[PDB]
Amino acid sequence: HPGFAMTVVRTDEVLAEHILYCSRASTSMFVGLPSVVRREVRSDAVTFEI
Amino acid sequence: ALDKSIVVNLTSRLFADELAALQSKIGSVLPLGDCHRLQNIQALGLGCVCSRETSPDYIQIMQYLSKCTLAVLEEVRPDSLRLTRMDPSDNLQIKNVYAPFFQWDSNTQLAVLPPLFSRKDSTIVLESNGFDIVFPMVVPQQLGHAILQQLLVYHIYSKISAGAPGDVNMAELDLYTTNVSFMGRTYRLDVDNTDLRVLDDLSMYLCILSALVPRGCLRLLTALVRHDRHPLTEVFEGVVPDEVTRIDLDQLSVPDDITRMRVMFSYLQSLSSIFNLGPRLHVYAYSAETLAASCWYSPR
Amino acid sequence: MEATLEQRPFPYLATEANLLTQIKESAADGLFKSFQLLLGKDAREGSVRF
Amino acid sequence: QAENAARLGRQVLGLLPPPTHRVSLTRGPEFARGVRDLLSKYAASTRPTVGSLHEALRQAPFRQPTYGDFLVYSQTFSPQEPLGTFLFSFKQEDNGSSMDMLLTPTSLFMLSGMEAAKAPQTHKVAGVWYGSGSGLADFIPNLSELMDTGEFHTLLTPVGPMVQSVHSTFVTKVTSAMKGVGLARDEPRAHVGLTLPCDMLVDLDESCPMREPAGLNVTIYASLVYLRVNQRPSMALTFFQSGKGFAEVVAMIKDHFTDVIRTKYIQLRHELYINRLVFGAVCTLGTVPFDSHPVHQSLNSLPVLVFANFEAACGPWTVFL
């Protein structure tokens, strides 16, 4: 035994399966219109962003 | 609106063995001497200039690549190859099938260089037509300016060891030149010292500079004395070695010194550009598992 | 994948002209690109397994 | 709900590359009727209207940039940028799958270590986006040694202006623009122009006149200068703006950095290291069209220019001296 003691600290992580509860009609949402914008057009592929 | 496609026909059908090698590189970059869609076989490689019977060249290839049109394979069908045309500033895709394998990254600048390594790494021989197609050496620009340099030093000291044995050590020469460090990684290149005749023309040029330059810059300083002399030229007198500034220019006459100063600059601009400017293209996306790089060509 | 040779009898049709002249020497030195010799019990029609 | 999917039927099929002009010969001379954008001189009337010239406005050239998708730590790329800054991609080694390092010009001001009065304005601003300067130098431990042999300019590939930055707590997603004018994200139908601080940019065409030709082109150049301050290596990055052609500007840059060259090469009368001989490099960051006025702005103050109609065309680094 050396002259000093010592304390030790771990961490530990636990998977959990939650129960979210949400009361009625709390958040009002606003849904817009989807647009499309091209990018990275090649002679091999035409990619799109929506 | 414009249509670009390059479709080369052949005279004879392909063998079953030669089809699997071009299927291995179904994406590649071929130089191609003509811009039209219909064309014969004798241009799409490097067999138009470089061949086995002719002496191997570096510079006449590098003169040729910047003058040449590049193209990309799409689909290999017997016997009609189907290349796609490369445009100025056009976005397309490259698969990286080149021997030896250098690893590509995105946001690197690809530089098309001529092949100076082994034959079976570079070319694929077509036995049906008796003509050799040659795939160039696509290497990133910082490697291509460094894989050239150590092999050009290795070519010089190979010329010294063949003239006198005592000046060059082989262990000192091999370990410092054939191992090339780039991006944290190391590549041991194939030496092919089995008998580097590609690089003999550059090793003739850089030496003929290296004698004429210190003889040349002495006369060019002393001839420009003015009261309107540029003030940075007073600083560079400390840079030149002291043994350079002790040349008796009474030894070489005026009809000799005009021939030197014209040989002085005419090698310089012919050697400056062949390190600088070739077909060089950018890459903005890459994936190692798919081995496919999205590129775009900058013609210069 | 080019065209290959197969031994399955699709039909076979009646040819008017004689093909039998100069066959013994031709297939030995390779006049044909794709040729197949059949002798003995192998001259029968093949199996219709699929 | 199919009315929302019918909008994607319009906007995708309306926005495609133009097809290859391929007409069969049995149809006849109908292929001449399919050539509309080559026609360039439209008829005008006594009172023309948009109903007369809606067909003239319909043919537009095919312009499109190529974006770069960068995934950056949120400590290097500051969470607030003016959305048009210029970018650089430092690259040392592929360590992980996708974690990339980006350098704004105020971020490379802090890694340099150059003095205050040589860039007196951005030193206040780049001192508040970052710490003392060692919050970034812990990524590159070789900044004392990359400056000696001069390998730092070979590890920057200029990329282009910002377009969009989606910022999270630990990781910022950065979308840049190469090849041309990047399309603006949040404001529709707009165009992101390139913003430089007024301090770094050194204008190059300036006369009393005491006559130079007009043109179509003026090219922004980047410079990166190896020097030593306080007997410690440090770099200096400046910008240039001139449409004079590459044969003049290399002579125009050497007259700008005259005093910097004079202070350095006093030191190598005593010790000559061949690695120290390399001095600077010059990149071409892409063209600006003629007579566009760089509009002054101010942010917190930080005076920042902005160049509309900028298109990015990156070049290599060529070592001038």
Question: What distinguishing features does this structure have?
Answer:
part of a larger assembly; 4 chains; B: 300 residues; alpha+beta; 3 domains; 5-stranded mixed sheet; D: 321 residues; 5-stranded antiparallel sheet; 4-stranded mixed sheet; globular; ORF25 (chain C); virion (chain D); Core gene UL38 family protein (chain D); Herpes_1 (chain D); capsid protein (chain D)
Structure commentary:
Chain A: This is ORF25. Chain A: It comes from Human herpesvirus 8 (HHV-8). Chain B: One of its GO terms (molecular function) is structural molecule activity. Chain B: This is ORF26. This is part of a larger assembly, with two copies of chain A (50 residues), one copy of chain B (300 residues) and one copy of chain D (321 residues). Chain A has 50 residues and is mainly β. Chain A has strands at residues 37-39, 47-49. A two-stranded antiparallel sheet of chain A has the order 1-2. In chain A, strand 1 and strand 2 (47-49) form a beta hairpin. By secondary structure, chain B is an alpha+beta fold. Chain B contains eight helices and 14 strands. Chain B has helices spanning 16-24, 59-67, 119-122, 141-144, 147-161, 170-177, 200-222, 254-276; strands spanning 6-8, 29-32, 38-39, 69-76, 81-85, 91-95, 109-113, 123-126, 131-134, 137-140, 179-182, 185-188, 280-287, 292-298. In chain B, the strands form four sheets. Chain B has a five-stranded mixed sheet with strand order 2-4-5-1-3. The relative contact order of chain B is 0.15. In chain D, the strands form four sheets. Chain D has a five-stranded antiparallel sheet, with no helix packed on it. The chains are: A mainly beta (50), B alpha+beta (300), D alpha+beta (321).
